[model samples]
Target chain A: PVLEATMICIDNSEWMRNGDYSPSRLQAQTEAVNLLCGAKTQSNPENTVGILTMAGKGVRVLTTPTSDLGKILACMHGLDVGGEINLTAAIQIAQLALKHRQNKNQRQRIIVFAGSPIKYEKKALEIVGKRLKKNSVSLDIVNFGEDDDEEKPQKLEALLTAVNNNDGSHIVHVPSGANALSDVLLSTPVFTG
Target chain B: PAPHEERVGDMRIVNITFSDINSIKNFQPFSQYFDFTLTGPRYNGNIAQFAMIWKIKNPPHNLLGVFFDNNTRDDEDDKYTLEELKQMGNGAKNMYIFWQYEQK
Candidate 1:
């Protein structure tokens, strides 16, 4: 039986429009989502997946949690990537979506693809992280793309540390790389058991 | 991986009561109850303010229960996306509420 519900919070901000990572941040994110979808659904026939864009008119919920891979993959296309992403909001939204899954036993997981700097303070993120921990939601962060003041990792770490929840949460910082975004996430906890 | 269980006897809650409900009133509507909003501080290049809202009838646990009447938001853009004046205003209001909860 599927034991988890995974939500991929893709960073479709203007930074994703860059070609720094493979085809581009957006493209890399798409590929990663697809790979994650495949791995997740296959891991447990009941395991479900969903997609959401962190930027654009607003954070868009491309699809709700479902075991159907095609539905989740199809929602990734034609997204209007704009603005900076609010990690706190994205994670909360993802958790909200995951909470309603048909299977209550499925663990909740959020995979954040962050390519830009974080604007929220460590204190604020800690609050958000505490919320996730209280809800028993595990978060996995992928920090890649651009770094202005080189504080992205520290800020994200601070948030993750607060929400660690017995280390159920995981974070990976991917530097500039040629591998497809999906390829990199395949080995991460987002897809693996 | 299987869901990790909390260590036995490790469960506890730290209840904090506000002196006045009006203190949280200025935060109003509790954005997390109506629409999803994500806000980071301004010092970190003000890049983490993107988020989206989704409506849910019954949320899980007491953590999300507080948000039952509140909407949820998440950050979507950090940079490269133009910061429109309207978005900034909307974001600011939501940020104020989010900050209120942080203070609590």
Candidate 2:
């Protein structure tokens, strides 16, 4: 019911090399990415979705917001996955991308896939989260992979909660042994809405 | 104000969200009969009904957008889905099209 422009922030850090999930963390994530793109582009012709990476050299944009299925699926191929994830900077970049969408009236959403540890404090995340809220941008987070430390989920939740405006922003926690990554997300309020 | 009484003529252009199509596909009574299509490749759902044609002119405006009431779902209670759309696309002879071609 809302015209939307989505920027999906992928986590491709070295932590994604774990074999706990199906073939591997990144491969499973790729499955989810395909489903996300299909759903977003199919819902409306004018709706556009974009992809970006949060690791390897630095936060990098694979493409700008686009409605072309080929462009979206092509960008996901052969991505680098070595450096650490920079959560704060990656989100800032996501917002920057959304700011220049071809259609400004379309609502903005940033889907963050967090598979690595977050170095920022929950307070700092809340600050940024609140900042996004002020800009009228919503966020959705998929918290999974490399969770040797249990505090990441809580921090991600805090981040999402701060950004949510009862306008459907959400956070999902997918542990190593849970259902397939995409199926779990497919049913969440975030995708359903 | 009944749900089934709503027609393409009574419908208005709607803003669509980029989310799961399944969610929007069955969007209750209003978006119920959507063909979810826009011509070119040719198509409607909670979707605004518009058709395409070439006008080839300059100085002012170039193309024209037209609207119409496709009564395909007007007098019936049946709903449209990927199943029906698929039948039409995959060269399958669905009952609706079968009747249309049969009538001709």
Candidate with best lDDT: 1
Highest-TM-score candidate:
2
Model 1 C-alpha lDDT per residue in residues B1-104, reported as the tens digit of each score = 89533111222111223443344344444421322332221111132222223222111122221221112233333332211211222223222212223343
lDDT of 2 by residue, A63-167 (tens): 777876545655665667878888888889889889999999888988888888887899999998999899888899988886576778888888988999876
Task: Please give each candidate's TM-score.
Answer: 0.63, 0.65
Report residue B38 deviation for candidate 1 (angstroms).
Answer: 43
Q: How well is candidate 2 docked (DockQ)?
A: 0.02
Question: How good is model 1 by TM-score?
Answer: 0.63
List interface RMSDs for the candidates, in order.
7.3, 17.5
